[PDB]
Design an enzyme around this catalytic site. Structure first.
Site, PDB file in Angstrom:
ATOM      1  N   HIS A  60     -10.313  -2.762  -1.627  1.00  0.00           N
ATOM      2  CA  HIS A  60      -9.170  -2.342  -2.628  1.00  0.00           C
ATOM      3  C   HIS A  60      -9.807  -2.928  -4.086  1.00  0.00           C
ATOM      4  CE1 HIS A  60      -6.092  -1.338   0.246  1.00  0.00           C
ATOM      5  NE2 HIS A  60      -6.609  -0.290   0.132  1.00  0.00           N
ATOM      6  N   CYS A  95      -0.597  -8.191  -1.160  1.00  0.00           N
ATOM      7  CA  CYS A  95      -0.203  -6.828   0.002  1.00  0.00           C
ATOM      8  C   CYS A  95       1.017  -6.832   0.684  1.00  0.00           C
ATOM      9  CB  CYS A  95      -1.436  -6.985   0.899  1.00  0.00           C
ATOM     10  SG  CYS A  95      -3.236  -7.206   0.242  1.00  0.00           S
ATOM     11  N   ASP A 149       0.785  -1.274  -0.019  1.00  0.00           N
ATOM     12  CA  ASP A 149       0.195   0.097   0.010  1.00  0.00           C
ATOM     13  C   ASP A 149       0.928   1.650  -0.022  1.00  0.00           C
ATOM     14  OD1 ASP A 149      -2.601  -1.219   0.038  1.00  0.00           O
ATOM     15  OD2 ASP A 149      -2.422  -1.635   1.939  1.00  0.00           O
TER      16      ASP A 149
END
Ligand SMILES: [Cl-]
Ligand SMILES: [Cl-]
Ligand SMILES: [Zn+2]
Ligand SMILES: [Zn+2]
EC number: 3.5.3.18
Lengths: 286, 274
Positions: A177, A278, A83
């Site tokens: 997301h 992620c 992120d």
């Protein structure tokens, strides 16, 4: 340089990486990480073991040079390094995360990417937010999810940073997301969930694009999050969720007979919305 | 996509160019045979090398400047503005260019206002907007007619010093990339253009104003293409262009036609047909 499209891979192939940045999870993740839904208690020790196995796949099995950043107990979400940075070729965009408390994670990522001698561009605009998890890079263009974490100004700064690639936005439902339901599974191959929400997003993406992508449709949206790598002397590689977690989606990945398939467990981190993409930032240092 | 083209119109130069073409300054004798070879090499780049369909108009000995087709037409998407050149004696060149653009199935708008003048060399199209130089050859009314013709695009004017065109010291070198000279005049004009537009353009600054005149093309199966002046002509400006590592750079000599103020953009009109 390379011409044509033949072969199983080369140092400039789509999905080629040489380096990965990861970050250990803190004990505070279990109680204090942000999460989209109430759910089961996180087993932090099990999450650590699963993260360690994931790093072992990238570094030991696949041969990437892995930079392992230390945990910060005051940053419960710090394991989710994707992120805070988006890397394309030799340029790293240090993002401005949508959750203000995660903005402290930027510093150590920026440090690590500087040491890898990347060109650093920083989101500093106080009106811009962007989570790397909202960015799908297909090899030909970017799609950026407009979510509760990423806004239009953040997408604009991404487009300004990677000027050589088209950038288009797609609306993403609250709590998600973009890559909560999609990822690249190979060259010109988008893994996508079967939900109406996921299919609506795919349609918006494909109508914005000047290209036609192939699709690998899986029954479980979360299992559409996978990591494709092109690895020297191995070729096409895919990290995907295990049959024990999503048996119906594993059945679809098993059909990819020209991929090296590697099942990777993420069951504990999924409780705080952490999926496969992620937990790493991938870099191709030529 | 910015810089796409499928056709080009060019015109052969007449023998009379050597002694009879207009020129802003006395200088060297023009070698007409060499200028012809340089023009043929230029046309070869556009047509044979880059694959544009080139319409080659014949020379007219009574029109010594007729090789400089840029000044008589501005083409934007499907519409051609046939200009009314600032030098009255060049207005005869309009007829044949109008005929050529008709055959390319373009929408034709003709500058006929007897108070309006405009040279295509005074027009910079960035892909987002037009900047029009107000020069000895292009006046306010000409710029207003251009704005009325290309109603989809913003148009702004910028003063240009006597004896120059706007593109005597600038041109597009790529998407969002303005090549610009370093002189007092060039930098004053650039500052005014940027003050008139919200859009942030990138700049490619070269030490020789004339070498800021280049041709950018976006060619299928090639990508970014740039015709620029040679290191033999302007070595310190060629060093700046050599830094564009994602462009296919094509050095093109124009040393003879430069003696009559003819630069790279001046010798073609580029058209994108679908
Ligand atoms: Cl496990
Ligand atoms: Cl494949
Ligand atoms: Zn994520
Ligand atoms: Zn000219």
């Amino acid at each position: 340089g390379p011409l044509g499209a033949a072969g199983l891979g080369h140092p400039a192939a789509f999905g080629r990486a040489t380096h990965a940045v990861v970050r250990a999870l803190p004990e505070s993740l279990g109680q204090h990480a942000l999460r989209s839904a109430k759910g089961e208690e996180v087993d932090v020790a099990r999450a650590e073991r699963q993260h360690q196995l994931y790093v072992g796949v990238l570094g030991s099995k696949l041969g990437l040079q892995v930079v392992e950043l230390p945990a910060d107990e005051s940053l419960p979400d710090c394991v989710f390094v994707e992120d805070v940075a988006v890397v394309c070729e030799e340029t790293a965009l240090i993002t401005r995360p949508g959750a203000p408390s995660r903005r402290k994670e930027v510093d150590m990522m920026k440090e690590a990417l500087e040491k890898l001698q990347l060109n650093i561009v920083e989101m500093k605009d106080e009106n811009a937010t962007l989570d790397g998890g909202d960015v799908l890079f297909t090899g030909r263009e970017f799609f950026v999810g407009l979510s509760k974490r990423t806004n239009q100004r953040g997408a604009e700064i991404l487009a300004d940073t990677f000027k050589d690639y088209a950038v288009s936005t797609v609306p993403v439902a609250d709590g998600l997301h973009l890559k909560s339901f999609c990822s690249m599974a190979g060259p010109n191959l988008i893994a996508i969930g079967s939900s109406e929400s996921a299919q609506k997003a795919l349609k918006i993406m494909q109508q914005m694009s000047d290209h036609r992508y192939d699709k690998l449709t899986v029954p479980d949206d979360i299992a559409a999050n996978c990591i494709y790598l092109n690895i020297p002397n191995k070729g096409h590689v895919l990290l995907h969720r295990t049959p024990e977690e999503y048996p119906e989606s594993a059945k679809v990945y098993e059909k990819l007979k020209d991929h090296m398939l590697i099942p990777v467990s993420m069951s504990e981190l999924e409780k705080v919305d952490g999926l496969l993409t992620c937990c790493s930032v991938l870099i191709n240092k030529k």
